[PDB]
Amino acid sequence: SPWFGMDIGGTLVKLSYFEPIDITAEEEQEEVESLKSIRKYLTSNVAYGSTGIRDVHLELKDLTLFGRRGNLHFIRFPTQDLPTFIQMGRDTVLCATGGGAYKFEKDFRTIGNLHLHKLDELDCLVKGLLYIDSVSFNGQAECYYFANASEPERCQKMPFNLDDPYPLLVVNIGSGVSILAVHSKDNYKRVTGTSLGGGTFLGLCSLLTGCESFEEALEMASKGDSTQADKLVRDIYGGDYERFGLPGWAVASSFGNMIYKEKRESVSKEDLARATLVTITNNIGSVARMCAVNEKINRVVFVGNFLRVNTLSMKLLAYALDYWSKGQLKALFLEHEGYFGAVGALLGLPNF
Amino acid sequence: SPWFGMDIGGTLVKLSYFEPIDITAEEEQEEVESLKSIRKYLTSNVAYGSTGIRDVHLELKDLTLFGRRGNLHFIRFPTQDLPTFIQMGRDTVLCATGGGAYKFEKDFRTIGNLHLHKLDELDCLVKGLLYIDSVSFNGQAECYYFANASEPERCQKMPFNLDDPYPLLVVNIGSGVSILAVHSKDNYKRVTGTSLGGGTFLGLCSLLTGCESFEEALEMASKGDSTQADKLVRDIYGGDYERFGLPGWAVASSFGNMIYKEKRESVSKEDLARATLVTITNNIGSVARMCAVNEKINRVVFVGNFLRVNTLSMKLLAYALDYWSKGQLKALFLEHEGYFGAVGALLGLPNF
Numbered sequence: 151s152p153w154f155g156m157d158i159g160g161t162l163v164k165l166s167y168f169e170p171i172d173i174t175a176e177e178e179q180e181e182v183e184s185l186k187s188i189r190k191y192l193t194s195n196v197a198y199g200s201t202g203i204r205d206v207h208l209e210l211k212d213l214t215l216f217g218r219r220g221n222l223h224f225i226r227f228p229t230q231d232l233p234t235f236i237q238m239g240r241d242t243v244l245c246a247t248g249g250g251a252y253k254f255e256k257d258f259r260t261i262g263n264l265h266l267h268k269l270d271e272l273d274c275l276v277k278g279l280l281y282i283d284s285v286s287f288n289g290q291a292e293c294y295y296f297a298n299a300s301e302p303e304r305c306q307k308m309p310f311n312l313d314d315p316y317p318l319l320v321v322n323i324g325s326g327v328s329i330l331a332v333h334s335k336d337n338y339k340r341v342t343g344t345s346l347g348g349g350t351f352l353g354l355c356s357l358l359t360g361c362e363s364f365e366e367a368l369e370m371a372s373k374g375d376s377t378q379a380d381k382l383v384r385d386i387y388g389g390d391y392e393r394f395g396l397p398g399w400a401v402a403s404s405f406g407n408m409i410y411k412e413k414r415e416s417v418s419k420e421d422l423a424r425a426t427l428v429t430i431t432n433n434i435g436s437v438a439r440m441c442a443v444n445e446k447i448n449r450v451v452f453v454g455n456f457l458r459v460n461t462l463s464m465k466l467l468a469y470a471l472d473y474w475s476k477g478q479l480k481a482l483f484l485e486h487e488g489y490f491g492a493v494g495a496l497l498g499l500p501n502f
Numbered sequence: 503s504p505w506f507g508m509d510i511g512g513t514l515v516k517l518s519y520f521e522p523i524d525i526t527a528e529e530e531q532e533e534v535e536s537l538k539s540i541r542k543y544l545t546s547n548v549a550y551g552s553t554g555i556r557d558v559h560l561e562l563k564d565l566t567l568f569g570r571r572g573n574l575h576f577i578r579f580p581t582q583d584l585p586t587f588i589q590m591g592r593d594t595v596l597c598a599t600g601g602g603a604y605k606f607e608k609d610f611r612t613i614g615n616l617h618l619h620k621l622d623e624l625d626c627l628v629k630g631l632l633y634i635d636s637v638s639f640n641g642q643a644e645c646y647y648f649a650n651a652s653e654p655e656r657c658q659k660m661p662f663n664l665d666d667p668y669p670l671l672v673v674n675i676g677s678g679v680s681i682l683a684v685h686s687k688d689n690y691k692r693v694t695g696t697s698l699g700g701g702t703f704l705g706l707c708s709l710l711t712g713c714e715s716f717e718e719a720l721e722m723a724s725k726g727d728s729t730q731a732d733k734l735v736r737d738i739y740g741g742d743y744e745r746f747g748l749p750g751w752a753v754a755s756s757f758g759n760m761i762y763k764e765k766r767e768s769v770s771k772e773d774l775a776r777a778t779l780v781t782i783t784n785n786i787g788s789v790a791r792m793c794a795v796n797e798k799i800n801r802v803v804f805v806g807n808f809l810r811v812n813t814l815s816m817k818l819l820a821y822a823l824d825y826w827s828k829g830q831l832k833a834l835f836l837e838h839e840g841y842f843g844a845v846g847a848l849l850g851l852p853n854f
């Protein structure tokens with residue numbers, strides 16, 4: 151059987167695939183044709199069908215896993231297209247996590263003799279995150295932060311060492327947000343969550359702007375000015391609110407200037423997209439800050455695909471977490487941020 | 503001079519007016535005609551102009567204040583109409599709080615010889631809240647909670663005693679949200695705030711539904727089904743997420759079902775209004791919960807005008823705070839919830 155791990159989320163399916171590269175002459179002979187066809191299909195294409203994508207830049211090359219050498223591949227497609235995936239499969243042991251491992255369990259069992267092993271979506275996350283950081287990103291750091299995030303002329307991506315990763319607050323921004331406190335490799339809990347996550351960004355953006363994709367929403371947001379929609383502290387006070395150290399630029403009311411009909415009539419789609427992004431990103435940062443203070447954890451790592459190709463939100467989180475915590479908290483990011491559940495599921499294979 | 507206190511917020515101006523009722527025969531003679539005209543104007547009308555309203559049901563009758571007996575009146579109008587108010591005044595000591603006491607300071611000084619005394623918006627809140635609870639609501643409790651908030655056949659408003667009110671978490675839901683921790687009558691701090699408040703509800707509702715007022719937004723929300731817009735835990739898992747005690751009905755992603763074009767095309771305005779209300783209310787509850795746990799405070803009182811004529815949000819807060827805290831936190835409400843800053847400002851009059 152090929153070695154897969156799958157994370158079926160509310161929005162995206164993430165698949166980690168281990169491609170062996172130490173196949174001997176004898177092993178090749180015993181390779182059944184359906185299996186050779188899968189390996190060739192996966193390694194010679196970067197787009198699969200109309201909606202599947204291999205993230206080639208994330209490939210881990212010449213990894214030793216389960217006593218074999220191979221390449222670790224990272225693939226994603228929309229959960230809405232899981233029926234296509236399962237139909238391809240009907241034309242072997244699957245370790246699966248995410249809510250969809252439960253929701254679609256009966257559908258995976260339509261593949262004859264398939265053994266589905268459901269693994270918990272946050273257990274897999276912790277195991278996958280720790281594993282990828284430990285093996286490194288082809289010799290480079292898996293984890294990074296934004297140095298001098300408050301000064302745009304200085305702000306830059308820099309590596310961060312996690313060789314002793316505990317304790318760690320993990321903020322998983324998917325459709326919603328789960329917040330985990332990780333005290334050791336076997337001692338972690340889900341602190342809380344928030345419903346204002348990546349699905350809120352995408353869903354509200356689509357309602358407000360008519361954008362047709364995540365990438366289009368980000369494109370619009372990059373051109374917009376959120377202060378056309380948001381009411382700032384300076385809109386209420388005329389300046390800073392000095393008594394409580396609130397700068398005039400801080401958002402007092404997200405979308406709060408949209409209570410005025412004339413402002414609704416002048417605001418652009420791009421402004422609304424940027425206000426949606428800023429509202430969601432600041433709320434995630436603030437909740438993370440409150441949880442870090444309560445858990446007595448000062449390293450906060452953000453994962454999940456809300457942040458893929460989303461440097462705006464990453465830089466906003468880096469700045470906001472640093473600013474509003476007075477430098478006590480540090481925002482961390484991971485190169486493989488959307489795939490840790492899929493990797494953790496793959497790592498469960500030896501238990502079956 | 504008449505005895506006023508004013509709280510000029512980002513959205514509403516709140517005015518507390520003390521009407522003396524122990525005017526002697528001699529005092530009446532010395533009553534200057536402009537002053538008699540103000541008192542008659544205020545006490546014989548319940549609507550002022552097109553946008554001012556006296557909340558007659560909140561009047562405190564036969565209150566002793568500053569050694570005189572009188573009635574305490576509660577009046578509100580939109581901050582957008584403050585120019586009309588100031589123009590009426592130009593056709594005496596004003597204790598004023600809220601951001602507008604700073605933003606509009608120069609405008610109040612266009613009233614000749616007027617003395618404007620700016621007081622801090624959260625200091626006034628604490629003083630006004632403690633004062634009104636102490637004098638009672640015409641012999642009835644100022645503070646109330648929802649008994650058995652989880653069972654709709656039982657859920658009912660019941661009085662709550664605050665004779666020893668400390669400590670107290672005060673959640674002020676105006677345009678945005680300020681969270682205060684009150685340890686004594688002179689020891690209180692602003693813990694944090696969130697930008698997702700009443701202005702977010704009203705602004706997003708107006709963008710999404712075309713509603714023209716707060717009351718219309720609430721009317722639409724009362725008819726809607728937020729689960730048409732929100733992605734629930736059961737939409738992702740097919741049921742409860744048992745491992746972490748998440749019920750299937752919990753919202754996993756606010757507006758998360760609006761990433762699907764066909765769902766955007768079937769959702770009603772009423773559904774969107776209700777989803778906006780639920781999203782904002784749950785976020786306020788969750789932030790309050792996290793702050794209460796960090797501050798080691800188990801009584802959480804919600805104030806501000808987001809909750810005026812808004813039993814939906816009050817009941818949602820009562821249920822959610824109780825459910826998600828496993829009964830450790832209690833949601834409290836106050837009959838005069840939008841006016842405490844205005845009262846606290848009035849109480850500053852003897853210092854000038």
Ligand SMILES: Nc1ncnc2c1ncn2[C@@H]1O[C@H](COP(=O)(O)OP(=O)(O)NP(=O)(O)O)[C@@H](O)[C@H]1O
Nearest residue numbers: 159160161162323324325326348349364454455456
């Ligand atoms: N191609 C894409 N399509 C859709 N959403 C995308 C895409 N790229 C990034 N996103 C964002 O990524 C989020 C989904 O992140 P992801 O971590 O994959 O969540 P999920 O696992 O599917 N959901 P959950 O069940 O809550 O864990 C979306 O809500 C978007 O904000």
Ligand SMILES: Nc1ncnc2c1ncn2[C@@H]1O[C@H](COP(=O)(O)OP(=O)(O)NP(=O)(O)O)[C@@H](O)[C@H]1O
Nearest residue numbers: 511512513514675676677678700701716806807808
């Ligand atoms: N008649 C109304 N007009 C507008 N908003 C209303 C009205 N009635 C209730 N609201 C709600 O009440 C909120 C304003 O509450 P309020 O406590 O008066 O805030 P504010 O003091 O003006 N703002 P802030 O400067 O942030 O303290 C609005 O955002 C609405 O959600």
Ligand SMILES: N#Cc1ccc(N2CCN(C(=O)Cc3ccc(C4CC4)cc3)CC2)nn1
Nearest residue numbers: 402432435436470471474678679695696697
């Ligand atoms: N990472 C991270 C992170 C990101 C944001 C964040 N904020 C906490 C602080 N804040 C507020 O208080 C908002 C607010 C200001 C004024 C008022 C009213 C007095 C007029 C109400 C509400 C903004 C959000 N905290 N942490």
Ligand SMILES: N#Cc1ccc(N2CCN(C(=O)Cc3ccc(C4CC4)cc3)CC2)nn1
Nearest residue numbers: 326327343344345754784787788822823826
């Ligand atoms: N008062 C008050 C109050 C109100 C709400 C509240 N919630 C905290 C708990 N919660 C979540 O975790 C949301 C969520 C669920 C699942 C997932 C993903 C696994 C698929 C992500 C996110 C809902 C909001 N807490 N307190």
Ligand SMILES: [Mg+2]
Nearest residue numbers: 159160248324
């Ligand atoms: Mg996920």
Ligand SMILES: [Mg+2]
Nearest residue numbers: 511512600676
């Ligand atoms: Mg206010």
